[PDB]
Design a protein around this ligand. Sequence first.
Ligand SMILES: *[C@@H]1O[C@H](CO)[C@@H](O[C@@H]2O[C@H](CO)[C@@H](O[C@@H]3O[C@H](CO)[C@@H](O)[C@H](O)[C@@H]3O)[C@H](O)[C@H]2NC(C)=O)[C@H](O)[C@H]1NC(C)=O
Ligand SMILES: *[C@@H]1O[C@H](CO)[C@@H](O)[C@H](O)[C@H]1NC(C)=O
Lengths: 49, 49, 49
Amino acid sequence: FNGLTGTGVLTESNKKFLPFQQFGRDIADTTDAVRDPQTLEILDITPCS
Amino acid sequence: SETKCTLKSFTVEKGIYQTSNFRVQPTESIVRFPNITNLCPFGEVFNAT
Amino acid sequence: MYICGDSTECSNLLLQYGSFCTQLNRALTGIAVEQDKNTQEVFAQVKQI
Ligand SMILES: *[C@@H]1O[C@H](CO)[C@@H](O[C@@H]2O[C@H](CO)[C@@H](O[C@@H]3O[C@H](CO)[C@@H](O)[C@H](O)[C@@H]3O)[C@H](O)[C@H]2NC(C)=O)[C@H](O)[C@H]1NC(C)=O
Ligand SMILES: *[C@@H]1O[C@H](CO)[C@@H](O)[C@H](O)[C@H]1NC(C)=O
């Protein structure tokens, strides 16, 4: 997603991303959500394995 | 067999063993870029006089 | 998952450090079993309810 390379399952999320907010991070500074550039819906990431 | 490989032994005692992941996670790839379509100015940078 | 989360290249690189994840997992499992043993020794003195 727009250079945000990452392996993991993408699933629809219930987050409340503000319009300016784009990525969405967590405590460990690891991207756990992305706002899709095509559709403004957000998708959270769960690692596989 | 996963448990046996985790312990590096061919015999396994009785109990609970937390097993390491010897499995194949990934399936495919997805690339979602913005739709912007116009060539970048490069002839005026490299081919300029 | 902590060091080289769902990255096969990083897992292959981590395999060159030997049995380091195994040692940490063994220590943590021992600590957890010790906690269970602590609770059992403190409370399960008499086995007549
Ligand atoms: C600066 O000007 C040069 C002039 O040499 C440009 O080089 C030319 O670039 C075009 C477009 O890529 C080349 O055409 C292509 O070449 C091959 C032929 O085998 C193939 O990929 C395509 O079928 C197409 O015809 C052209 O050959 C090439 N000319 C030379 C002499 O190498 C260059 O693109 C301009 N821009 C920059 C940023 O350098
Ligand atoms: C590009 O166009 C698509 C529809 O074709 C739209 O959903 C998407 O948001 C656009 N992407 C941009 C403007 O980055």
